[PDB]
Every structure is written in C-alpha cells, then in structure tokens.
Amino acid sequence: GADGVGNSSGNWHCDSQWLGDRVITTSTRTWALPTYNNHLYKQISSQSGASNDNHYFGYSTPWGYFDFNRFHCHFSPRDWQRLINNNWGFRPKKLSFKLFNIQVKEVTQNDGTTTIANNLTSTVQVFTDSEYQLPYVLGSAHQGCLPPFPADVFMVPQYGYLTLNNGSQAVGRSSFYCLEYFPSQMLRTGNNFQFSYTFEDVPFHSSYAHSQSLDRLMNPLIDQYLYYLNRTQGTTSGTTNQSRLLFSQAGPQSMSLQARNWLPGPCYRQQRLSKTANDNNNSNFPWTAASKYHLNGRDSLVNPGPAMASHKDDEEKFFPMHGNLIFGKEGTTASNAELDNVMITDEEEIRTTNPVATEQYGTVANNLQSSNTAPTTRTVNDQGALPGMVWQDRDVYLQGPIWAKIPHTDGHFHPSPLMGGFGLKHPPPQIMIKNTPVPANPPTTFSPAKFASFITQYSTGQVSVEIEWELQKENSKRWNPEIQYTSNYNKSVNVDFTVDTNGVYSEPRPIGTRYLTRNL
Amino acid sequence: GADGVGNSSGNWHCDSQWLGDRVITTSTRTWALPTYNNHLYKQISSQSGASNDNHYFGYSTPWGYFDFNRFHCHFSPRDWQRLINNNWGFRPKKLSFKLFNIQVKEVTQNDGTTTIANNLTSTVQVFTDSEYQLPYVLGSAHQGCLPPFPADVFMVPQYGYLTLNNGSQAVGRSSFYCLEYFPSQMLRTGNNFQFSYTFEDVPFHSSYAHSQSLDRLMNPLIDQYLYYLNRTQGTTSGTTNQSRLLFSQAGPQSMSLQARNWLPGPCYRQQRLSKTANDNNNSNFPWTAASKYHLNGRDSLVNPGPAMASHKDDEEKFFPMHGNLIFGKEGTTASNAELDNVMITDEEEIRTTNPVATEQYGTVANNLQSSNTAPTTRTVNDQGALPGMVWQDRDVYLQGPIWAKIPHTDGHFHPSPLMGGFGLKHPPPQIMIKNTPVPANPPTTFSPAKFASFITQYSTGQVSVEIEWELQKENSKRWNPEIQYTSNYNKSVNVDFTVDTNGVYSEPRPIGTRYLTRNL
Amino acid sequence: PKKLSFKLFNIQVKEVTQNDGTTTIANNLTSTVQVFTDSEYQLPYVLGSAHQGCLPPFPADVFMVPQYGYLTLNNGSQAVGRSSFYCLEYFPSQMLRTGNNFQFSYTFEDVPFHSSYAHSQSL
Ligand SMILES: Nc1ncnc2c1ncn2[C@H]1C[C@H](O)[C@@H](COP(=O)(O)O)O1
C-alpha cells in the first residue's frame, strides 16, 4: 500500500464474532518505539564473577519486536468464557498482521523544556524472520505483549539474543547476527505493513476434564475372569500352616487389585510446599532442595516439569515447588513479592491421568525374595516413559502462552510446550521494527571516524493482529449439569476484569480451560 | 400405519441435538392406562354445604389424556444448562406426536391370585381435539405429565371438566360433553397413532436480565437541560424569608429527580412473608389477608399476580404471599408440608423493570395544597396500566409450564400465561385415550337393561413427542464475564439431578432462565 | 481384525408368574426388547477389562447377558461435581417384537499385526 500524509493507512479493527464452527479474533493496539542501544549493536555477557549458573554471552540489538503470545491479547474475558464453557477443544488456524498510522516524532531538549514535533521525512524499518534464521526469542514468557485491555498503550520491547558460551567467555562456534543484513521494508508516514501466516496441523487443546479415572475404568457389577495372587502365607493359620500359594478372581471388591490395561503419565517428583508459612521447614531451600537439571555442567531449574497433579483430594493447600505457572497481580515488584500478591495455578483436573507432582510414583521390587531373604520395596521418585502410559498435557489460561517453537534437533518426544500451548515446528515468525537512524549535523571537513551523532527520535502507530480459531464442539450425553465458569452474582466491590477508580485494568484470577467433562 | 402382532409399531426415540440456530427435543416414555369411572360418565359437583368459594359443577369422563406441558418433559438437566447459559431467548416451533407398541392386558381375580394375560382382539381409542370443542383443561399445573427421568413409567391421568354453576347447582346454559360423539381412531396391537402440529407466532421468552435500570438509564457525566422545582419555601432563611419558587437544572447529583421517559410495570400489592417462622404475625392470614379477586360473588386467590419483584436489595428472605410459583420436592405429602420440603422461586432479575411485590408502588397527590391546606400524600397499593409503562414477564423453570390456551373472549390485554410461558390462541390440542369397553358374559335371554358387566382390562404402550425450538443467539459486547449456572464442584453427597440409593430421580432446585445480560 | 457383522434374531419374550408354589412361564407376544449401539462413544467403555459374560467357548452352551454398570470420578466414598450420570434411555433405541431382528456392521481401523512369531536371534 502507498498513500499520503493526511491519509490514515489503516482503521481500528478490534472485534470478535463466532461461526459456531470457528471463531475469528481481531485485535488492534497502539504501540510506541524508542531508539534502543543508541543505534548500536552491543556485546553483552555475564558479570566478571557475579554468578555461576547464570553465566551467559550474547548481543543487544537496536531493533524492537512485536509479540502477542498471550491469549488475553486476542480473547476478551467474556469470549474466553464462551470458549471455555462450550468447546471440547480449540486451535489456531490463520493469521493477519498489519502495521499502520505510523508517526515519527523527534524530540529536542533545548533549555529546560522538551519539545516534540513531526519529522515527516523520517522512516521506520520492518521485516519478518520467515526463514527462521534469527534466534527465536518468543515463547519464553517475556513481557511486552499486547495489553489485555484495548485502551492501554504499550512500549515495543527490545531484541536481544544469546549464544553458545563457556562461562563468561564464548566459543568459536558462537554466532553473531546483524538484522541489517536482512532485507527490510522502510516506511514513511502513510506507508503500511502487511503479513499473512498459516498455522500448521497441531492437536486441539484439552478444554475438557475426564469424568472417569484410569483405575476406575472397569465394571462395578461384574467380576474379572482373570486371576491374581493375593495370599502367600496366611492360610487357615493354626496348625501346620506356614505358607501356601493362593489366588483370587478379581471382583468389584478387589478394585485396586484388578488386572489393568494402561498406566499413568510419566513423572519427575517436585517438593511439596504449603501456602501456610508455618507448615514448612525453617530453612531456605528454593534452590538446594528443588528439582533441577544440568547441561554442560550448568544447573538449571526444572520449573514447569512434566504435567503432574498439584495436590491430592481433600487438601487444596499444598502446591508443588514451582510445579505450575504463577502469575503476578497488577502492580507488584519483580523482587520478592508477598504470597498474597501472586496467583498460583491449580492443576487438579488431570488427577485421573497424571501422577501427583509432590507425591511418589509407586512401588518397585529390587531383590530376590525367598525363605532366606525378605522382599524389598523401593519408592520410585523418577519415571521415564513406558509402553502403555497415557497422560494429559498442562493447561492454557487467559493470560498464558499460546505457542512455542519446537527446537530443531535430531529428536523430540512429545513436543508440547512445557509451559503449555501448541508446539510448532514453524510458529508465527518474528516481526522486527526499528527507527531509521538520522544523522545529526555533520562537519564541513571529512571525518573517517564512525558516526555517532544522531537526531533523537521515537516512532508510534497502530498494529493489528487477526487470528482464526478452529473449534471442537461438545458432544456429551451427560445427564446432570456440568460445571461452568461464572462471576459471583453477589453484591461486590469492584467488577471482575475491569478498570478501577483511576483507570487500571486488572485480571483478578487465572482462568483454566477444563470445565467440560469427557470420558476415557 | 398397519402391521401385525409380533411386529413393533415404533422405536424408542429419545434424544436431542443442536443446530446452533435451533434445537430439536425428542422424548419417549412408557405409559399405562386404567379403566376410569368404570366406563361411565359421572356428574360431579360440590358437597352439599361443605364449602362456599369452592362450589363447582362438572362431569367425570371414562377417558384419559396425554400431557407434557412441563419443560423437563423435553429438556434434560444438561440441555437446559446449554440453553440457559447461551441464548437471549427461545420458542416452540413444531410438534410430532406418536403412539405405539400398544398392549391390552386383561386381569382376573380368581381366588386370591390376580392373573394378567393378553387380550389381543381388544382395542384402544384415540382422538385429538383440534377444533377445540372440548374444554381445554391443560395449562393448569395439573399432574400426570411425562416423567422428568426417561426410565420412569407414568399413569395416564383422567379427563374431567367444569361448567357454569350457581353454587352447588348448575344453570341452563351449562354444557355436557360426550367424547364418544367424537370420531376416534381405534387401535389393536400393532396399530399406531400419528399427529403433527405447528406452533403459531409467539414472542421469544426472556432468557436474559437487564444490566441497566429504568431510573439509571441516563448519563452519569452530563447534566439535563430540563428544569424541575425542588424548593418551595426554604430560602436564605433568616430575615423575611417565608417562601419562594426555586427551580434546579437536573444533574448527575439530582439522580432520582431527573426528567423521565418511562414508567415501571403495573402492580398488585402482595403481603410480605418471612421464611423465619418468628418474624411473622402470630395469626393465620393465608386467606383473610391475601390479595384475591371475586367473580359472580365468588372469592378466588390471586396466586401468580402481575410480574413483580420478590424482594428488594439486601434481604433475600422475604418472599411475597404466593407472589411466585412454589415446587414440591420429591416425596412430600399434598397436605401441609414443611418449609424445608418446598422450593420457592426467586424473581430477583426483573428488579429493574418491575415493582416489588410486597412493597408499595409510589406516591400520589390527593388535595389542593395552599396557605390554608397542607399537601397530602397517598400510598398507592394498586396500579392499572399506563401509557409509558414497560415490564418484563415472569420466568420459566426446568419444571415449569410451557404454554397456555388464551381464553376466547372479546378482549385480552397482555395475554401471557400468569404462571409463565407462551400464550397461545391455538395450543397443542388435547389427545384423548381410553380402553374400548369389553362386555363380559351376556345372558341367553334378552335384557333391555343398561349393560354394566364388563371385562376388567388395562392398556399400556409407548408415546413419543418431538418438539423443535427456535433459538435467539446471544449478541453482547459485555467485556467482563457474565454469570452462568453451574454445579458445585465440591466434594458432594449425592449428584445433582440424579437417582438415589434405591432408584428415585430428584430435582434439587428450581432453574431460572435469566443468566445472561442485555441492556435497555 | 478387519470387518464385523452383528445380528440379533429369533427373539422370544417369556413372562413368568408365581401363582401358588408353581412357577408358570408363557408367551407375551406383544412385548418388546430394546437395542442400541454406542457408536458415538458417548457411554463409558466398560469392555476390554477382562469381565465375564462373553460368548461361550463351546457353541452348544447357553449364556446369561451381563448387566451394565459404570464408574465415575470420585473423592473417596463421595463424588465430585464433575462426575457424570448417564441414562441409556436418552439414547435412540430400536424396539423389537417377536419376528423383528437387529443388524450392525463395523470396520476395524489400521492396527499392527500381532506377533505370532518368536525371534531365532538375540539382541
Ligand atoms: N503441541 C503439539 N504439537 C505437535 N505434536 C503434539 C503436540 N502435542 C502432542 N503432540 C503429539 C501428537 C503426535 O501423535 C505426536 C508426534 O510426535 P513426533 O515427535 O512429532 O513424532 O506428538
């Protein structure tokens, strides 16, 4: 598209309607972009002896980027409700990215007054990493996404990437990337940017919860025709009754003893924590007692491990040591905030397919029992994969991640984003943005010296993201009502999901996705 | 249709699927029919001096009838949920009635043993009052409908009608009806009955509740340009300031004083009752203090009067003297049951359009105020209709009535069934049923005497009712979540809407229809 | 497995009466029976749990048709709000009198051959 100065290069498209078979979410926000790194690429690295498991090496780029890898970027509270309460599952389909109404303001600090004006002849630069040649930095829960509330304005984040490193140093195999060596479209006021993307085939999310259990799958009325051993010694114990091999036919009575066809999902035990700050051990163990992995001799915390249940029945107070995603309430410092200032997510719908995160896995034998030796039991704390296991993945919440770029390696197992969502080989490419550097005043004499005197300026405009969603409708013969998400009809202070007395949108609680029931 | 003995004349069609634009409810139940009134039409009437406001005159017919004027006859608990939580409104469209799998069993009491067998050569008789010539006895909350639970069997009710009466006596203008003077189809085993009906145009029900109020409709920020009088005397009161006419311009501050364009709905004050059996007056006033009407010098209790709100804000304990429909729990005598044995329905969603049932209506002047006379106020307890009034009708619950035959008179006002539902000029006609009388053993000598010796027999079979429902989808731009009906996810004793330990379906609570919000 | 053909026939409905000390059994011709197949897989699948009531190994043997019972999500002896109650009457079913029959055809999906072999080599 190509138009003029006094002619808007786009309209405000923010709406969503339903097709019963699918739903299209249109979102528009206002963005602002500073000049990052002073038009410079900078080599960043770990502090000279400041930390060990946090060593790193990379670069800081003068470029910014757009992101909307949060569900609340596209769905409104209400829409999310309809979605959750009605559909077995859902998925992404298409994508439409649009940049418009661009304005480049240049600022000057004269005396003690900052004046801002229009630099019409100035441009901005956009390009999309569709060949996936730039390090994919999205899908890491970073901030700078689109505001949940449409009326809010946001600052466009800065691009920074990491590389292979040996402590504070780097290896010869490390990689340096210049985004200037990429063809980019430059835009003046009245120019716009267009982009269309098509999601790959990716399994529906589980917007459902099982009404049956793995162990409670059989028939309560009929007995099995299979036999198991339940008595090794205990006979008609009185006279001459040491031991005897006795077998029983499985019945509704021997419910946790019946033959089985399937196993629970894998596991990686997490430490149990209480929300009550006195049930816990009087010691600081969020690192020395937490489950972690290490690569290249570098410890890294296994935060959202395999999908495991948060708590067993009749507790609802013990959450796993970081066994789930925790969201921070609006207005709360990034450094050591209170327990009443965060929102911990409960994964208690997957109890029927998944092992409890804090609890064990089960029992394993590890000896040759006999008259000479007593049978030994081992408590299994870590279980790899097994032929016959079935599990449910995590959950997506209104403010959770949407997709994630599956790493390009030789092998993957069950490539679903650990933080939750859709694992994509080729995910919505990265869209870069940056203000074209404008040389300040040059000398009448020639200078070979690198240019570093530029006019200070920032850009602003609108951005629009349209996404189509395929839906999986609900087909259940459940007689009684199922559970639905709802607002408290009671007389209330402030309205859930709303601005306050001085204009600040706030998301009260996290929103699960599993409210509807399907069988096994 | 015409087939044989060992050939079922129909299948069990009980299911419901959705079309997003409409929903079709198919229901099948098993019915049983005795021989009523001993194959006789009987003249019934009021007891010789047993009651005065309960005097009556009519007849008892040997016929039975089919009824399904209850929503739970067609919708399952779950379906009702989907319906309620998703649609602005709904309505009836088509109808399909089917009778089949008929069996006529004749019983004989020989000694002390009742033997039951097959009388194949016996018939049953059906016909549908489509000319509306038989007194419409449906839409009166009578019992004998189709069981909420599909597995339950029901007894087919008996037909009885009333006529014009003068106390215990009747007038010459009274009417006697013989259902034998109607053409009816007789069916043997293997015969079936078919019937299709088409609902008329009738306004959608309000499956919504207003998010705005009548008095709270204007703009909170801007002031009106209209003026009202708010001060008659109170001036700069000190010296020589008796009285002065002063007017104010309506503002957000004068909120309950601003000019108005609309009025609340009509009213007929009801007496206030408390659920706490000690707040009330120590006197029995359910008749001597209740609002009632009288025709022909006969008192009749105004049970579900005009649609009025049950209680004002911050109470939820005071219900109107019969100002709403009350349902009896499963297993509870018809005579003086406990308060904890009934379900009282709350009409607290229509607070914004309707006057409170127990509270007053407002203030009216009734004198010519002056220096000589002080202004007089009258508390209005009864308000007819008024140009500019707007009201919401009652509500339909999972177990409430569906339709009602609007009486054929010279005039109607707002012909909506007082008990709630769809007022129909021509509602689903009455379907009659009766076992064809079989003469027992006759004498070898001729007798002119009326025959009264018959073989005792009862009929049984299946019945199927299919109804199509037009839906009005939800189109709201509400940002925050709306309230939804849901089951308590908590650890529970018995499951809501389910059979118990010995096989008895029970409906826990009444189900409203207004969960979604629309503006004014 | 590849294909499947299910057929019900020669149905007879006998009704019994205990009069004095003698049980008499006779024919109730006008009586029906009801069949339906969960093809939408909406009823809890209770098969494949080694239960009894299958078809007799020996053809000459007669068998009793088992009863349907299912389980749901539970919290000890209690149930959760997310539990599910199923009524098989809310399913369209075909009713049969004497002389009526039931027909059904099914097609297995692609599933790897079973190992009717044993390796002559070792790992
Ligand atoms: N989010 C997501 N994306 C892709 N695949 C998923 C996902 N979640 C579960 N799976 C399953 C579906 C396939 O059966 C399997 C392919 O693994 P492979 O290692 O590709 O053979 O992985």
Ligand SMILES: Nc1ncnc2c1ncn2[C@H]1C[C@H](O)[C@@H](COP(=O)(O)O)O1
């Ligand atoms: N249930 C029902 N049936 C029919 N009409 C209804 C109903 N509820 C409200 N109304 C309104 C709709 C029309 O504007 C008006 C016709 O009244 P009339 O007296 O017919 O001129 O009555």
